[PDB]
Design an enzyme around this catalytic site. Sequence first.
Site, PDB file in Angstrom:
ATOM      1  N   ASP A   1       5.717   8.525  12.855  1.00  0.00           N
ATOM      2  CA  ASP A   1       4.350   8.872  13.203  1.00  0.00           C
ATOM      3  C   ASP A   1       3.732   9.671  12.065  1.00  0.00           C
ATOM      4  O   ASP A   1       4.422  10.124  11.150  1.00  0.00           O
ATOM      5  CB  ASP A   1       4.266   9.675  14.501  1.00  0.00           C
ATOM      6  CG  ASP A   1       4.829  11.064  14.361  1.00  0.00           C
ATOM      7  OD1 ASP A   1       5.594  11.318  13.411  1.00  0.00           O
ATOM      8  OD2 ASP A   1       4.478  11.924  15.190  1.00  0.00           O
TER       9      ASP A   1
ATOM     10  N   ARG B   1      12.729  26.451  13.972  1.00  0.00           N
ATOM     11  CA  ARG B   1      11.947  26.624  12.749  1.00  0.00           C
ATOM     12  C   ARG B   1      11.115  27.890  12.929  1.00  0.00           C
ATOM     13  O   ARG B   1      10.026  27.854  13.508  1.00  0.00           O
ATOM     14  CB  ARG B   1      11.077  25.406  12.460  1.00  0.00           C
ATOM     15  CG  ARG B   1      10.361  24.831  13.670  1.00  0.00           C
ATOM     16  CD  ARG B   1       9.350  23.782  13.253  1.00  0.00           C
ATOM     17  NE  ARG B   1       9.985  22.512  12.915  1.00  0.00           N
ATOM     18  CZ  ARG B   1       9.339  21.471  12.403  1.00  0.00           C
ATOM     19  NH1 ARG B   1       8.039  21.548  12.161  1.00  0.00           N
ATOM     20  NH2 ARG B   1       9.994  20.355  12.127  1.00  0.00           N
TER      21      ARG B   1
ATOM     22  N   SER C   1      -0.624  22.835   3.331  1.00  0.00           N
ATOM     23  CA  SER C   1       0.735  22.518   2.910  1.00  0.00           C
ATOM     24  C   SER C   1       1.100  23.191   1.594  1.00  0.00           C
ATOM     25  O   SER C   1       2.282  23.446   1.344  1.00  0.00           O
ATOM     26  CB  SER C   1       0.903  21.001   2.790  1.00  0.00           C
ATOM     27  OG  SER C   1       0.318  20.334   3.894  1.00  0.00           O
TER      28      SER C   1
ATOM     29  N   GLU D   1       1.455  26.411  14.833  1.00  0.00           N
ATOM     30  CA  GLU D   1       0.829  27.689  15.145  1.00  0.00           C
ATOM     31  C   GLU D   1       0.254  27.719  16.550  1.00  0.00           C
ATOM     32  O   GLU D   1       0.094  28.804  17.117  1.00  0.00           O
ATOM     33  CB  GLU D   1      -0.287  28.025  14.152  1.00  0.00           C
ATOM     34  CG  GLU D   1      -1.553  27.193  14.325  1.00  0.00           C
ATOM     35  CD  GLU D   1      -2.727  27.729  13.531  1.00  0.00           C
ATOM     36  OE1 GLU D   1      -2.566  28.763  12.852  1.00  0.00           O
ATOM     37  OE2 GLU D   1      -3.813  27.121  13.589  1.00  0.00           O
TER      38      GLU D   1
ATOM     39  N   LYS E   1      11.642   8.905   1.189  1.00  0.00           N
ATOM     40  CA  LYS E   1      11.613   8.180   2.454  1.00  0.00           C
ATOM     41  C   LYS E   1      11.440   6.685   2.228  1.00  0.00           C
ATOM     42  O   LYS E   1      12.218   5.877   2.742  1.00  0.00           O
ATOM     43  CB  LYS E   1      10.495   8.723   3.338  1.00  0.00           C
ATOM     44  CG  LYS E   1      10.908   9.884   4.208  1.00  0.00           C
ATOM     45  CD  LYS E   1       9.745  10.388   5.030  1.00  0.00           C
ATOM     46  CE  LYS E   1      10.216  11.351   6.094  1.00  0.00           C
ATOM     47  NZ  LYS E   1       9.075  11.967   6.811  1.00  0.00           N
TER      48      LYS E   1
ATOM     49  N   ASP F   1      12.523   9.131  12.050  1.00  0.00           N
ATOM     50  CA  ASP F   1      11.907  10.383  11.655  1.00  0.00           C
ATOM     51  C   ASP F   1      12.564  11.488  12.469  1.00  0.00           C
ATOM     52  O   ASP F   1      13.500  11.246  13.231  1.00  0.00           O
ATOM     53  CB  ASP F   1      10.394  10.333  11.880  1.00  0.00           C
ATOM     54  CG  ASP F   1       9.643  11.351  11.065  1.00  0.00           C
ATOM     55  OD1 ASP F   1      10.174  11.784  10.025  1.00  0.00           O
ATOM     56  OD2 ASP F   1       8.516  11.708  11.459  1.00  0.00           O
TER      57      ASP F   1
ATOM     58  N   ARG G   1      26.897 -34.539  23.733  1.00  0.00           N
ATOM     59  CA  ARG G   1      26.534 -33.130  23.686  1.00  0.00           C
ATOM     60  C   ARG G   1      26.931 -32.382  24.943  1.00  0.00           C
ATOM     61  O   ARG G   1      27.338 -31.227  24.860  1.00  0.00           O
ATOM     62  CB  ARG G   1      25.034 -32.967  23.471  1.00  0.00           C
ATOM     63  CG  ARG G   1      24.573 -31.546  23.615  1.00  0.00           C
ATOM     64  CD  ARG G   1      25.227 -30.647  22.590  1.00  0.00           C
ATOM     65  NE  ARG G   1      24.692 -29.295  22.663  1.00  0.00           N
ATOM     66  CZ  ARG G   1      23.600 -28.892  22.030  1.00  0.00           C
ATOM     67  NH1 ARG G   1      22.930 -29.734  21.270  1.00  0.00           N
ATOM     68  NH2 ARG G   1      23.177 -27.649  22.155  1.00  0.00           N
TER      69      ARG G   1
ATOM     70  N   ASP H   1      13.232  18.204   7.856  1.00  0.00           N
ATOM     71  CA  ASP H   1      13.547  19.564   8.262  1.00  0.00           C
ATOM     72  C   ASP H   1      14.720  20.084   7.435  1.00  0.00           C
ATOM     73  O   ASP H   1      15.142  19.459   6.461  1.00  0.00           O
ATOM     74  CB  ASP H   1      13.832  19.609   9.761  1.00  0.00           C
ATOM     75  CG  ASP H   1      12.590  19.357  10.604  1.00  0.00           C
ATOM     76  OD1 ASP H   1      11.471  19.435  10.057  1.00  0.00           O
ATOM     77  OD2 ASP H   1      12.733  19.079  11.815  1.00  0.00           O
TER      78      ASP H   1
ATOM     79  N   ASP I   1       4.543   9.133   7.054  1.00  0.00           N
ATOM     80  CA  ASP I   1       5.508   8.040   7.047  1.00  0.00           C
ATOM     81  C   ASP I   1       4.862   6.668   6.903  1.00  0.00           C
ATOM     82  O   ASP I   1       5.494   5.658   7.223  1.00  0.00           O
ATOM     83  CB  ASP I   1       6.354   8.085   8.316  1.00  0.00           C
ATOM     84  CG  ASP I   1       7.123   9.367   8.440  1.00  0.00           C
ATOM     85  OD1 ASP I   1       7.538   9.906   7.397  1.00  0.00           O
ATOM     86  OD2 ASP I   1       7.308   9.849   9.572  1.00  0.00           O
TER      87      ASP I   1
HETATM   88  N1  LIG Z   1      -0.347  27.204  10.289  1.00  0.00           N
HETATM   89  C1  LIG Z   1       0.849  27.311   9.661  1.00  0.00           C
HETATM   90  N2  LIG Z   1       1.360  28.520   9.337  1.00  0.00           N
HETATM   91  C2  LIG Z   1       2.547  28.642   8.713  1.00  0.00           C
HETATM   92  N3  LIG Z   1       3.317  27.596   8.362  1.00  0.00           N
HETATM   93  C3  LIG Z   1       2.927  26.326   8.626  1.00  0.00           C
HETATM   94  C4  LIG Z   1       1.640  26.109   9.307  1.00  0.00           C
HETATM   95  N4  LIG Z   1       1.497  24.778   9.444  1.00  0.00           N
HETATM   96  C5  LIG Z   1       2.595  24.192   8.900  1.00  0.00           C
HETATM   97  N5  LIG Z   1       3.447  25.114   8.413  1.00  0.00           N
HETATM   98  C6  LIG Z   1       4.745  24.831   7.749  1.00  0.00           C
HETATM   99  O1  LIG Z   1       4.578  23.789   6.785  1.00  0.00           O
HETATM  100  C7  LIG Z   1       5.450  22.683   7.039  1.00  0.00           C
HETATM  101  C8  LIG Z   1       4.635  21.403   7.169  1.00  0.00           C
HETATM  102  O2  LIG Z   1       5.512  20.278   7.170  1.00  0.00           O
HETATM  103  P1  LIG Z   1       5.914  19.558   8.553  1.00  0.00           P
HETATM  104  O3  LIG Z   1       6.708  20.539   9.383  1.00  0.00           O
HETATM  105  O4  LIG Z   1       4.676  18.914   9.129  1.00  0.00           O
HETATM  106  O5  LIG Z   1       6.909  18.388   8.068  1.00  0.00           O
HETATM  107  P2  LIG Z   1       7.703  17.493   9.144  1.00  0.00           P
HETATM  108  O6  LIG Z   1       8.733  18.319   9.812  1.00  0.00           O
HETATM  109  O7  LIG Z   1       6.669  16.932  10.244  1.00  0.00           O
HETATM  110  C9  LIG Z   1       8.501  16.099   8.304  1.00  0.00           C
HETATM  111  P3  LIG Z   1       9.350  15.068   9.529  1.00  0.00           P
HETATM  112  O8  LIG Z   1       8.360  14.221  10.231  1.00  0.00           O
HETATM  113  O9  LIG Z   1      10.431  14.131   8.790  1.00  0.00           O
HETATM  114  O10 LIG Z   1      10.099  16.012  10.596  1.00  0.00           O
HETATM  115  C10 LIG Z   1       6.220  22.980   8.317  1.00  0.00           C
HETATM  116  O11 LIG Z   1       7.629  22.924   8.055  1.00  0.00           O
HETATM  117  C11 LIG Z   1       5.759  24.356   8.779  1.00  0.00           C
HETATM  118  O12 LIG Z   1       6.835  25.299   8.871  1.00  0.00           O
HETATM  119 MG   LIG Z   2       7.016  12.864  11.172  1.00  0.00          MG
END
Ligand SMILES: Nc1ncnc2c1ncn2[C@@H]1O[C@H](COP(=O)(O)OP(=O)(O)CP(=O)(O)O)[C@@H](O)[C@H]1O
Ligand SMILES: [Mg+2]
Lengths: 1044, 376
Positions: free
Chosen positions: A745, A527, A471, A428, A725, A294, A1008, A609, A749
Amino acid sequence: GLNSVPLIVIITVTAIKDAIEDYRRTINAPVHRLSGKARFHKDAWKNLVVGDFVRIYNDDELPADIIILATSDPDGACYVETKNLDGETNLKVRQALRCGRTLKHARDCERAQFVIESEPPQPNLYKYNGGIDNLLLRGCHLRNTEWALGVVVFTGHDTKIMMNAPSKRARIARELNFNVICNFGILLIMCLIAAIANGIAWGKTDASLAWFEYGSIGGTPALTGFITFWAAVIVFQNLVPISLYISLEIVRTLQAFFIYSDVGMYYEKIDQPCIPKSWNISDDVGQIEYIFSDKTGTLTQNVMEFKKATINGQPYGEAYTEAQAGMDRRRGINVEEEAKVIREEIAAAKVRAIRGLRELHDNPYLHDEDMTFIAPDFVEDLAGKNGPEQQQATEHFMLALALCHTVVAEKQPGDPPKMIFKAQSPDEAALVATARDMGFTVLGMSDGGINVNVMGKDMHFPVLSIIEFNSSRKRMSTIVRMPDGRILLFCKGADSVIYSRLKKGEQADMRRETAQHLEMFAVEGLRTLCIAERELSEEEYREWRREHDLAATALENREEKLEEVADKIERDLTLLGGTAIEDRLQDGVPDTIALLADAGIKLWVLTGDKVETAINIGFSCNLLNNDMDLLRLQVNESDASTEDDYLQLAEEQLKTNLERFNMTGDDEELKRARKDHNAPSPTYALVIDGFTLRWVLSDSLKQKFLLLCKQCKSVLCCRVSPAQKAAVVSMVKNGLDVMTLSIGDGANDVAMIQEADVGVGIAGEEGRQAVMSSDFAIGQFRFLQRLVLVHGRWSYRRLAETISNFFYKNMIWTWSIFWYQCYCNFDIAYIFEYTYILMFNLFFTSVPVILMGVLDQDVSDTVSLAVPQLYRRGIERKEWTQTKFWLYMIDGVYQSVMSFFIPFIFVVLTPTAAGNGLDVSERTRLGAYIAHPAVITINGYILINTYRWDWLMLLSIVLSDVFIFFWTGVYTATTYSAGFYQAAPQVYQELTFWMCLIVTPALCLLPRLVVKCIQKQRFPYDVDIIREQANRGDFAAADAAAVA
Amino acid sequence: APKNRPPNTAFRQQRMRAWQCVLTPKLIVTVFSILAAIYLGFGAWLTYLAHTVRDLKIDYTDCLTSAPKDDFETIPQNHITAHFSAKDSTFDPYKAQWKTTEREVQVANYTDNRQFCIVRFNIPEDLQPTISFFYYLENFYQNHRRYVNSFNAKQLLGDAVDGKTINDSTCDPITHDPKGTGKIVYPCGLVANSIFNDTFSSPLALAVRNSSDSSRPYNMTTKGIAWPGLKDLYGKTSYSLDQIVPPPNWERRYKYGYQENNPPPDLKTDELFQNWMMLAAAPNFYKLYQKNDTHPMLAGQYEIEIESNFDVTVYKGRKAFVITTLSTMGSRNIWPGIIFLIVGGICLVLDIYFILSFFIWRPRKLGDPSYLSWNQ
Ligand SMILES: Nc1ncnc2c1ncn2[C@@H]1O[C@H](COP(=O)(O)OP(=O)(O)CP(=O)(O)O)[C@@H](O)[C@H]1O
Ligand SMILES: [Mg+2]
Ligand SMILES: *[C@@H]1O[C@H](CO)[C@@H](O[C@@H]2O[C@H](CO)[C@@H](O[C@@H]3O[C@H](CO)[C@@H](O)[C@H](O)[C@@H]3O)[C@H](O)[C@H]2NC(C)=O)[C@H](O)[C@H]1NC(C)=O
Ligand SMILES: *[C@@H]1O[C@H](CO)[C@@H](O[C@@H]2O[C@H](CO)[C@@H](O)[C@H](O)[C@H]2NC(C)=O)[C@H](O)[C@H]1NC(C)=O
Ligand SMILES: *[C@@H]1O[C@H](CO)[C@@H](O)[C@H](O)[C@H]1NC(C)=O
């Protein structure tokens, strides 16, 4: 008894092993119950049967899947808490069944018998019949009920609360059927020889059989043969692997205990050692070729720091990440000296910003070495310098970072009070965690809203409402009353979501620079986020809120009504600035990945990502190199909606990448690739998007794709959904015949964990959803190098040798019985004093094999990590082959020949053979003569094979070899034997007994020992060379660093 | 302290005291130099022992046919086998005069007539004070699934176990009188039925006219030829002599049943029956008949009377009698010595090969990093 007593001790020891495994895993809850106890006495969970009366008080835990028939409260209702089991929090209400609502007493439960024709396991969480009105869960808590007339329907494991937790089996525990079936084949061949030879030798009618033996068991030659066949099946019983599975179960559960109790894999924070939830897969870990990882919680720490922010076009970056570190230093500019002086200047700016922060009013929650938005420009601007309104911009921004949230506050007294800010997302939470890092400390939702001490002097913010992130939102909004009386709306989120909800054509001078700042951020390896504000009015917010509520009060279709009526206020927003969030690479990953990829296995990073952050942080985590000429698969857009564009683009891309070498999509180059495991070339790598994946995982291209994804050393899958995945795991685990590990985690996944052979769950920051569905609940990623590279290759080599020796020894015993049968006209006569035939596979020869399987190690704990390449021998599946099985069985047959015909040549070819005149070479004295050297040679032959003769193994060898002497000395001296009555003093006192005892094991071990020595000298493996190196003391400096 | 770490010991962390058994051409040679030494030593000892003892086995399965009734003649040396070292004395244990005859015998008040064989052999060395006398039976299987379990040891112990508890025991064929009268069989079974019952005389030193004593009998006793622990299994009977009968082919010994003047055998003192009841393990076996403990067997020609009751040529078998003297190993087995010497000799050859090669031919520098399969 010869077969019935083994066949009961087998189930006894199996029950005992299950019990002791439960013991050393969990390391008797109360339920009131009664069909004959005349009272709802209390009892414990180990007293559970089917259809027995029960009473259940307030808030009790429940024992198993229960049905009820009545209770005290009217309607027969019962409440349950289920947060431990089902993610919904509501107190779920069952009703006690209707007909039978009158049973209320202590003995009045008995007479009203009611039939319960229930249904088999109905795993589906919302299904039961014979609905859910009668389904009482196990982990749930039963509430608001004086008592509960428990008449359940199931118990033990027949409850879903334990059933929903996919039993997998190792790769060789599934290819063992060929060996067991070949054992039965050789057993039936021996038995048919016995039948067709006894039937003949019984039809001679002149030999000494006719005169002195009055007929046969059943008078016929061809029926004497048949009775001989079945009696031989009974006598060559030892070649029944009935005891193989109870030996492998023991060695596997004990290896799994050895990895549960490892202290090198104890992560001190979460307080959880590597609890192996799948003990029967411990050797699968030694054959892994693919790891599907991951990129959050797994590779990275998932604790996000606020790194950069830009407001009013003024950026406060003043920071450095490891991605750009690698990117710049890998060429001639900024290579090494700048690589250090850059962090030197960073630390200088940290000190200067600490000074600037401590120029402000007292905020006790500000602590050194806990601030990650270091910017002396920020604090110099907020103090008053370099801006009249940019100071106001920074103040408003810093207050917004302390308002826009729903985060809850937790204070630590004692030392200077530092507050932790907990919320649902580590994304956040960093914004408000840095809000408190420069002042503006926030307290709880103070009954009108949160309390912010602006520049340390306190003030309240009346929070009107909150529209929380999902989401499906990618943003979150907070409408709060500004302390000057007015109201103000905030909305923080990503770029593509807010930028449409902006006042079109305003502050373009600022927007067209904050957007490019965002570009630089995202390409630098972060990010980023952005924040918008909007000045609301009271009547405008009211005419929004009215529709928000009237669509929210709607029970049905609520999910798509609030998206409409909440959007009526979100169209108008204006930017306050742009931010940046980093998540530190975990401590010990850049080495774990180099180590794994050094062992020969392939690493796939199914990152969710972006793509450029993925490539750069794959360079930074040692996954990529400069010689890895990565080749990329990308189909673009503008291809309308027509698959021929997409499919043809993906096809030509794959075809060109496959013409970069031999050929594409060849099911003769696939039928061949499906059978080789040769340590991928370290020169190639793939970067595939999450869009191109969807089209190359089309069914006409998968084969092609597969071939490409076998040639490369690494594969990045940027921006994959929870679907691809698990889809790629399945495609490469079922396309090829390969082994597979999947790390992760969070509930994101679970499918990756479950569709693979081995599924490892990091007890991640997100949740315990990838722990409850995993095999091994790893603390953090770098324990993979310990597990896979130590316990993996050990647990594989150990079971290889154990099953090899377990076949060898059964062969050497039963074939030495067979060899005797040649001298009793194949009429099956025991040579061995039957109690030997029932004790052999239990006492004389079991413990040494189990021990060489559970506590033997070829190199070391630390020489196995110093040299990872040894793991390659378990990737090629070269420890348990078919040549090894046949070589060991031929060894068993030869040693059987010698170990029966030496103690026969000794005694049955002399008149007396006893040196004081009297008669040994009775039928059972010869039995002792050939049974003591055999039990010596079996154990002394599983010492030749063991690598590390430790204390327990030699002690158990000695105990097993002296137990036969002890128990013959103790069993003889009693007339209950009556033919084997004093064989202990009559055999041990002899000289020929001890001469055979010392010359049979050597004559059976030399062919042996000679092979072993000549090979370990002339055709050596890698393990023996690393052993001869750890004998000089080469890796003794590695052990030295390890002990230091 | 609500900790959860696993206790750091020497077992859970897999650190137990060990000895890494890594082969080295200084551990290989110091093993094939200890095995070769021990086995050549023990083999030399055992072959010296096996060459010590001296014995003579005469085969007489065909004495009832190829022996004239009148006087003596020579046994064809395809029957005699002899292991002495007198090296051509005037006795030459390969010239064994032999004759047959038929003679009446007073068994018990009814005087049945048997058929005897007289053998006159030569013993050229003074054998030593422990001299056993075995009989040898080829092609006679005492090891069969039905033959070995067929007895009632609770009755050989001496008991009145009667009727059904014996009718349905493992001795199924032979459990009643093969006649009208309902009678138990006392030594009942299938193994007590077939007891070898030739009788040998004690060897009688014939008169060469040089030693004044014409024929001094060399009394060999049949007392103490079984283990003294077997008498814990057998005992004098307890039936009232009115409910027992000899087994089928015992009749020529007890033709009128078990009478007060022909009473059942006392199995405890019977040490030719406790040699039969402990079963052999092969078809060709030996059993002890007579033992001498207190005198040496002087050289000269001896004579034995063997009444030939056990007809062995009817199942293509053979029978013989052997006079052995003992060693501490047993009787003459040339094979333990040669087996020990072969194992020792091949350990010596392998020791030469290893010391030589691994010291003189390509030592193959230890642990060198060129066979590691990833340095290639
Ligand atoms: N409170 C909030 N305000 C604004 N954006 C948010 C938010 N909470 C989550 N997000 C956005 O939504 C997305 C949620 O997906 P997340 O980032 O959990 O996937 P991930 O990166 O964990 C998959 P992997 O485990 O493969 O890395 C994030 O990319 C984040 O930028
Ligand atoms: Mg993950
Ligand atoms: C092993 O064999 C030797 C054979 O010599 C046995 O010794 C011989 O045994 C007899 C027993 O009778 C001796 O006694 C003789 O008794 C008669 C009268 O009863 C007497 O007239 C004789 O002069 C003589 O005393 C005989 O002495 C003895 N032989 C010699 C030469 O003394 C020996 O007993 C055998 N072993 C066992 C266990 O018996
Ligand atoms: C043991 O089995 C024998 C065989 O039947 C028993 O029976 C005797 O059988 C013969 C025929 O062979 C009859 O003439 C006898 O009359 C039978 N016995 C009696 C009671 O007269 C013998 O009886 C068996 N033992 C028991 C318990 O009866
Ligand atoms: C010794 O043997 C002779 C004949 O060989 C015999 O008459 C005599 O009874 C035997 N002596 C004893 C004590 O048995």
